Amino acid sequence: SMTKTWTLKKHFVGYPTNSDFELKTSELPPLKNGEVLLEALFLTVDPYMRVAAKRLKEGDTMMGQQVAKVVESKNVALPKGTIVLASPGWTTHSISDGKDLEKLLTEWPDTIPLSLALGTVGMPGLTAYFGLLEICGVKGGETVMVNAAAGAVGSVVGQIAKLKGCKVVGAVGSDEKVAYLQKLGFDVVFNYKTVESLEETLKKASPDGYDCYFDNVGGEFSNTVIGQMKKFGRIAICGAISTYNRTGPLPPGPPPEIVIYQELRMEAFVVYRWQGDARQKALKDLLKWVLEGKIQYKEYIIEGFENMPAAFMGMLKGDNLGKTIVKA
Amino acid sequence: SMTKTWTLKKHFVGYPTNSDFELKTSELPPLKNGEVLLEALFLTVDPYMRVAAKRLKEGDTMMGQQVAKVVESKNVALPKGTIVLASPGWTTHSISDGKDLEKLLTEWPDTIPLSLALGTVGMPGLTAYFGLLEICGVKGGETVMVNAAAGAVGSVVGQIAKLKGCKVVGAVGSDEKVAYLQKLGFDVVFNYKTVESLEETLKKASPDGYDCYFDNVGGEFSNTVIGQMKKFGRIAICGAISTYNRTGPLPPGPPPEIVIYQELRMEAFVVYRWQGDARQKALKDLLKWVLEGKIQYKEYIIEGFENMPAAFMGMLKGDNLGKTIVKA
Ligand SMILES: [Cl-]
Ligand SMILES: [Cl-]
Ligand SMILES: [Cl-]
Ligand SMILES: [Cl-]
Ligand SMILES: [Cl-]
Ligand SMILES: [Cl-]
Ligand SMILES: [Cl-]
Ligand SMILES: [Cl-]
Ligand SMILES: [Cl-]
Ligand SMILES: [Cl-]
């Protein structure tokens, strides 16, 4: 029994590079009672991994989630054939004792792709859902600003806000991505890389200002948004992608007189806070809404486990339209 | 009747200097029916005036609150001799229609100075009260970080926090202020100017982190504190005084990966949000606590209305121990 695994050969300095990763082949032990051998079917790459990777030692396996098939079982809860979510990292095969795994929703249809369990009806959809519904606390009627809005979190956020009856303003890094989010029914979408002035564009997009800001990117982009927040505006801090790969100091912060005069609430959050019933209800909603056509999905599938570092690097550069997913 | 008024001659570049202010003498109109003539007894200077003054046109009067006596009345609610809070700016005499004024508390004793109405039992005490009890929402048993902690706002925050059963860690700018706050019963107090490393002082002062941070200073000081916040820690953003007089770009914002990881809540506030009964219950709670000795106060009184800019500059530059009042 053999496995292939991507390790961190070297801590990243700015953007990752091929030389910071190393593929190692390895013999997997035999199964003890209560254990299963899992075969990776679909592996995800996500922005957080740029950040989570600083917590690793050189030689450690890259963290990450997958959809795996149980190929060998000594666990009666999980027979051969069973499909599960698992986070053994960037690895083709892994041994699990059962207790770190998740079967899919019972009601899960054959008419949707299994890899949605890693996207829209998985962790990024849950991030959108809870960030928007619990942290921004949108009610309906509100004007929501969402950035990295063609990203896996962003695009779900906007689609949930539309079906709660909000105006949604979305910012995007490419013109393919602009067209895509207009198909999905966002009120105003623009390419931030091409606009002459973010300030003027955001002003023309909601002259009123923004009730809510779902922030994925941070930096000077967020400083500009903060200057057009309505009084008692709410900000959900989900990520700061524009900062993860920097080589210098952080940009200036939110201009503090504006934050104070406007009495803003900013609250940061991580998806994993919500477990139990709250989480299962959220998943079931994301499933409902997908099947009703209220949330549309798109995937960028890269064939082959050899191509994972490239998938990650591509996603980080903004090269891909859809959730990046490696088939394997 | 004449008045003297301090105007903004020139917009401040970094700190103010004397030449940015101009004293003018002006004749006042006779009173119409329902109006009163106010003579200033005590005027305040406050950090926010540095920020607010950026919104003035040159020639404009400096903004600010005072304790004033009604010396001429055509208003039956406000007979000669009545003491009021008023905000005509930095002027010795002004005219009111009476509807923008505030009489002192009914139960206001002779055994305290009138000028506490501009400080501890006034705007800065209210700032502390609501920032701490509503925004930080301290319940008791929590460790509170307060900066500019021997200032008008910070010293009250610390004393209310003590009396609600919190550990209080205060940062201060002089060793006289360190001494003073230790007499007031703060748990840890230090001089942020003398300490070798802020990071390490905060780490020894609360090994377990900070539940709440009442933030008056902002900038790099705050970035260091954020690195020490407990998970789900609460920041009340009240001011950012370290930035008001700063001549360059703003310093690096708070490090987003830590904010997100710790799921921090930051909320900005202005005192004038709380009005009506809530505001009155707070003024009565503050005055009660003063009489009981649970809140001590220190004033730095400066004689003469012509000394008001120097007073302001001395306040901004950390010159003084106690609330800066001009008699006036
Ligand atoms: Cl078993
Ligand atoms: Cl099988
Ligand atoms: Cl995007
Ligand atoms: Cl963007
Ligand atoms: Cl993605
Ligand atoms: Cl009258
Ligand atoms: Cl009189
Ligand atoms: Cl300080
Ligand atoms: Cl101080
Ligand atoms: Cl003061």
Side-chain angles (χ1 to χ4, degrees), chain B residues 129-138 234-237 266-269 273-274:
Chain B
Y129 182 102
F130 292 119
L132 189 62
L133 307 174
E134 303 247 329
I135 285 83
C136 286
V138 298
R234 304 180 300 294
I235 315 184
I237 306 153
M266 323 184 176
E267 192 177 342
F269 69 101
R273 192 200 301 198
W274 295 272

Short mmCIF file of all heavy atoms in Angstrom, two decimals, chain B residues 129-138 234-237 265-269 273-274, unseen atoms left out:
data_model
loop_
_atom_site.label_atom_id
_atom_site.label_comp_id
_atom_site.label_asym_id
_atom_site.label_seq_id
_atom_site.Cartn_x
_atom_site.Cartn_y
_atom_site.Cartn_z
N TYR B 129 -17.80 55.16 30.41
CA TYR B 129 -18.93 54.40 30.94
C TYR B 129 -19.52 53.52 29.81
O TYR B 129 -19.55 52.30 29.93
CB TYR B 129 -19.96 55.41 31.52
CG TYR B 129 -21.19 54.82 32.16
CD1 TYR B 129 -21.31 54.73 33.55
CD2 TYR B 129 -22.26 54.35 31.38
CE1 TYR B 129 -22.43 54.18 34.14
CE2 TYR B 129 -23.40 53.79 31.96
CZ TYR B 129 -23.48 53.71 33.34
OH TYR B 129 -24.63 53.16 33.94
N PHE B 130 -19.95 54.15 28.71
CA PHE B 130 -20.59 53.45 27.59
C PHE B 130 -19.63 52.60 26.75
O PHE B 130 -20.00 51.55 26.29
CB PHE B 130 -21.34 54.46 26.69
CG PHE B 130 -22.54 55.05 27.36
CD1 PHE B 130 -22.63 56.44 27.58
CD2 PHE B 130 -23.57 54.23 27.83
CE1 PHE B 130 -23.72 57.00 28.24
CE2 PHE B 130 -24.70 54.79 28.49
CZ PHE B 130 -24.77 56.18 28.69
N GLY B 131 -18.41 53.04 26.56
CA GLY B 131 -17.45 52.22 25.86
C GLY B 131 -17.14 50.92 26.57
O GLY B 131 -17.02 49.88 25.95
N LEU B 132 -17.04 51.00 27.88
CA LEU B 132 -16.72 49.86 28.73
C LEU B 132 -17.92 48.95 28.96
O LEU B 132 -17.87 47.74 28.68
CB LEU B 132 -16.14 50.35 30.09
CG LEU B 132 -15.58 49.20 30.95
CD1 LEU B 132 -14.39 48.48 30.27
CD2 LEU B 132 -15.21 49.69 32.27
N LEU B 133 -19.01 49.53 29.46
CA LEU B 133 -20.13 48.74 29.90
C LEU B 133 -21.02 48.30 28.75
O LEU B 133 -21.62 47.24 28.84
CB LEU B 133 -20.93 49.44 31.02
CG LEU B 133 -20.12 49.91 32.25
CD1 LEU B 133 -20.99 50.70 33.18
CD2 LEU B 133 -19.46 48.73 32.95
N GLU B 134 -21.09 49.06 27.65
CA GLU B 134 -21.90 48.68 26.48
C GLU B 134 -21.12 48.10 25.31
O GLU B 134 -21.54 47.13 24.71
CB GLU B 134 -22.60 49.90 25.94
CG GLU B 134 -23.47 50.60 26.93
CD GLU B 134 -24.94 50.49 26.60
OE1 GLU B 134 -25.27 50.41 25.38
OE2 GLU B 134 -25.75 50.49 27.55
N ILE B 135 -20.00 48.71 24.93
CA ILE B 135 -19.31 48.26 23.74
C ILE B 135 -18.39 47.07 24.05
O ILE B 135 -18.54 46.02 23.43
CB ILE B 135 -18.63 49.44 22.94
CG1 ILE B 135 -19.69 50.22 22.20
CG2 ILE B 135 -17.71 48.93 21.87
CD1 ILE B 135 -20.33 51.15 22.96
N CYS B 136 -17.47 47.21 25.01
CA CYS B 136 -16.70 46.08 25.53
C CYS B 136 -17.60 45.13 26.27
O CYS B 136 -17.29 43.95 26.38
CB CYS B 136 -15.63 46.50 26.54
SG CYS B 136 -14.19 47.31 25.87
N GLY B 137 -18.67 45.66 26.86
CA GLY B 137 -19.66 44.84 27.56
C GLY B 137 -19.08 44.04 28.71
O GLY B 137 -19.47 42.89 28.91
N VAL B 138 -18.14 44.62 29.48
CA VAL B 138 -17.51 43.88 30.59
C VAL B 138 -18.59 43.42 31.57
O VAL B 138 -19.51 44.17 31.88
CB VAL B 138 -16.39 44.67 31.37
CG1 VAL B 138 -15.23 45.03 30.47
CG2 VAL B 138 -16.97 45.89 32.08
N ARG B 234 -12.78 41.73 22.52
CA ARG B 234 -13.59 42.87 22.17
C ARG B 234 -12.79 44.13 22.32
O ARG B 234 -12.23 44.39 23.38
CB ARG B 234 -14.80 42.90 23.09
CG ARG B 234 -15.53 41.57 22.99
CD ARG B 234 -16.74 41.40 23.80
NE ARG B 234 -16.63 41.50 25.27
CZ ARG B 234 -15.97 40.69 26.12
NH1 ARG B 234 -15.22 39.66 25.73
NH2 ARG B 234 -16.07 40.96 27.41
N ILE B 235 -12.72 44.89 21.22
CA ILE B 235 -12.10 46.19 21.18
C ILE B 235 -13.17 47.25 21.04
O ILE B 235 -13.98 47.16 20.18
CB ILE B 235 -11.09 46.29 20.01
CG1 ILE B 235 -10.26 45.00 19.98
CG2 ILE B 235 -10.25 47.56 20.13
CD1 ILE B 235 -9.18 44.98 18.97
N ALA B 236 -13.17 48.22 21.93
CA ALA B 236 -13.96 49.43 21.82
C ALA B 236 -13.05 50.48 21.25
O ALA B 236 -12.12 50.87 21.90
CB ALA B 236 -14.44 49.87 23.19
N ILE B 237 -13.31 50.93 20.04
CA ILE B 237 -12.54 51.99 19.41
C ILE B 237 -13.18 53.35 19.71
O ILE B 237 -14.21 53.74 19.22
CB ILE B 237 -12.37 51.76 17.90
CG1 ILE B 237 -11.78 50.37 17.66
CG2 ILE B 237 -11.46 52.83 17.28
CD1 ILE B 237 -12.16 49.82 16.35
N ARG B 265 -13.87 41.14 17.75
CA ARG B 265 -14.95 42.11 17.48
C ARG B 265 -14.43 43.48 17.80
O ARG B 265 -13.96 43.70 18.88
CB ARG B 265 -16.18 41.84 18.35
CG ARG B 265 -17.44 42.72 17.97
CD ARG B 265 -18.67 42.44 18.86
N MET B 266 -14.48 44.40 16.84
CA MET B 266 -14.06 45.78 17.06
C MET B 266 -15.20 46.69 16.74
O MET B 266 -15.80 46.61 15.68
CB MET B 266 -12.86 46.11 16.21
CG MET B 266 -11.95 44.90 16.14
SD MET B 266 -10.39 45.06 15.28
CE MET B 266 -9.78 43.42 15.63
N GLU B 267 -15.50 47.56 17.66
CA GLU B 267 -16.59 48.43 17.44
C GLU B 267 -16.25 49.82 17.89
O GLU B 267 -15.73 50.03 18.96
CB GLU B 267 -17.80 47.89 18.18
CG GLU B 267 -19.05 48.60 17.75
CD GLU B 267 -20.26 48.04 18.43
OE1 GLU B 267 -20.18 46.90 18.97
OE2 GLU B 267 -21.27 48.76 18.40
N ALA B 268 -16.51 50.76 17.00
CA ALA B 268 -16.24 52.17 17.18
C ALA B 268 -17.46 52.88 17.70
O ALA B 268 -18.56 52.41 17.57
CB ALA B 268 -15.78 52.80 15.88
N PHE B 269 -17.25 53.97 18.41
CA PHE B 269 -18.40 54.59 19.05
C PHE B 269 -18.05 56.04 19.27
O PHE B 269 -16.89 56.38 19.37
CB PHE B 269 -18.86 53.84 20.35
CG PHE B 269 -17.90 53.96 21.48
CD1 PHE B 269 -18.13 54.87 22.52
CD2 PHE B 269 -16.73 53.21 21.49
CE1 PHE B 269 -17.24 55.02 23.52
CE2 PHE B 269 -15.82 53.33 22.52
CZ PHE B 269 -16.05 54.24 23.52
N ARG B 273 -24.11 59.14 20.95
CA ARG B 273 -25.10 58.12 20.66
C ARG B 273 -26.12 57.95 21.79
O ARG B 273 -27.30 57.73 21.52
CB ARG B 273 -24.45 56.76 20.43
CG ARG B 273 -25.42 55.72 19.84
CD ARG B 273 -24.98 54.29 20.06
NE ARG B 273 -23.68 54.05 19.49
CZ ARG B 273 -23.17 52.84 19.21
NH1 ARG B 273 -23.84 51.74 19.50
NH2 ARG B 273 -21.99 52.75 18.62
N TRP B 274 -25.66 57.97 23.03
CA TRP B 274 -26.55 57.71 24.18
C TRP B 274 -27.14 59.00 24.70
O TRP B 274 -26.39 59.89 25.09
CB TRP B 274 -25.81 56.97 25.28
CG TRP B 274 -25.39 55.60 24.84
CD1 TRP B 274 -26.11 54.48 24.93
CD2 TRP B 274 -24.14 55.23 24.23
NE1 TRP B 274 -25.41 53.42 24.41
CE2 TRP B 274 -24.19 53.85 24.00
CE3 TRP B 274 -23.00 55.93 23.86
CZ2 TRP B 274 -23.13 53.16 23.43
CZ3 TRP B 274 -21.97 55.25 23.28
CH2 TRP B 274 -22.03 53.89 23.08
#
